[PDB]
Amino acid sequence: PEDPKWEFPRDKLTLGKPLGEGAFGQVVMAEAVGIDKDKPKEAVTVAVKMLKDDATEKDLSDLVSEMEMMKMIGKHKNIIHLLGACTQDGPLYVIVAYASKGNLREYLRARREEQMTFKDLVSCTYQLARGMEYLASQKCIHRDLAARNVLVTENNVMKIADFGLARDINNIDYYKKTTNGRLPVKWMAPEALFDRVYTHQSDVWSFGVLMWEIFTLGGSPYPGIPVEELFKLLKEGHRMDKPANCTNELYMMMRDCWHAVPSQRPTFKQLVEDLDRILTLT
Ligand SMILES: Nc1ncnc2c1ncn2[C@@H]1O[C@H](COP(=O)(O)OP(=O)(O)CP(=O)(O)O)[C@@H](O)[C@H]1O
Ligand SMILES: [Mg+2]
């Protein structure tokens, strides 16, 4: 099944050193000659997501589904961008934009290299609120928004990544009946955890937990509480505490995203407006 507008010649692709791995594939650095149509002569440094030697049938299928999802999203400043793919005659290669600073979690943990200021943190939250606004506008739910799924480029631009669990949503709620779920519990909304319902407001909840990760410089959500005990505490109204240096205006923002009623939570459009005002006065 070839899509000519995304197919990239294998000869033009030279693989390099590894960049990371999980239990769904691996990512290697690579050189791609003429993949950028704006400069069709220069070789572009890219990242290639591919299967592993111990890959499964679902691993291949998930990588194919993540490829099709990224085709629909399009380019944005705060979203990792699909550049091409190698599907015909050989292993599936998913070629995406390269980010040299890693993922946001290890990025912030390595600044407790550089050093993070209050403006830097607010700048991070603003860009991630803009990437989700365009993502929500494109009729998409990420379902796996976390600090580890955000990439940082050489010029410190936040890139939303990991669309393996992303789905398209229309005007009503997304809903399926599952033998068991696959979303990280500590970032899930109560309706996603209990009712198996996911909307753009469920991504707002994850954004709140994402805010907590950012202002803790890479801490783990609900510190000291196992995944097993989080179930009962969410039903009873437990929320995370305010970080050490985090303005109350930004903690009320987190508590807004963490509202029980999904429709009562802010929209990503409103988060961009509020963060814009907070950022300009710094
Ligand atoms: N464009 C890119 N540039 C540099 N590193 C990248 C990258 N894209 C992904 N990576 C890194 O490759 C590593 C593994 O990739 P990926 O994030 O897709 O696996 P994963 O996180 O879904 C499995 P797990 O969560 O169990 O570790 C990650 O640490 C990620 O930061
Ligand atoms: Mg990840």
Numbering used by the authors: 469 to 580, 595 to 764
Can you provide the manuscript's text about this entry?
Receptor tyrosine kinase (RTK) signaling fulfills fundamental functions in development, tissue homeostasis, and metabolism of metazoan organisms. The FGFR subfamily of tyrosine kinases has emerged as an excellent model system to elucidate the molecular basis underlying allosteric regulation of RTKs in a physiologically relevant and unbiased fashion. Our data reveal two clusters of hydrophobic interactions, termed ‘DFG latch’ and ‘αC tether’, which relay allosteric signals between the A-loop and the molecular brake. These hydrophobic networks, located strategically at the interface between the N- and C-lobes of the kinase, sense the structural fluctuations in the A-loop and molecular brake and undergo rearrangements to determine the kinase interlobe angle and hence kinase activation.
To resolve the ambiguity surrounding the A-loop conformation of the molecular brake mutants, we also retried crystallizing FGFR2K mutants bearing single and double mutations of the molecular brake constituents. Fortunately, we succeeded in obtaining the crystal structure of the FGFR2KE565A/N549H double mutant in a different space group than we previously solved for WT FGFR2K. Similar to crystal structures of single mutants of the molecular brake, the FGFR2KE565A/N549H structure showed a disengaged molecular brake. However, unlike these previous structures the A-loop in the FGFR2KE565A/N549H structure adopted a catalytically active conformation with striking resemblance to that of A-loop phosphorylated FGFR2K. Two mutations within the molecular brake disrupt the hydrogen bonding at the molecular brake and drive the A-loop into the active conformation. Lastly, as a control, we constructed the N549H/E565A double mutant in which two mutations target the same allosteric site (i.e. the molecular brake). By contrast, double mutants targeting the same allosteric site (N549H/E565A) or two adjoining sites (I547V/E565A) gave only a subtle increase in activity beyond those of the single mutants. This lack of synergy between N549H and E565A mutations in elevating kinase activity is expected as either mutation alone is sufficient to disrupt the hydrogen bonding network at the molecular brake.
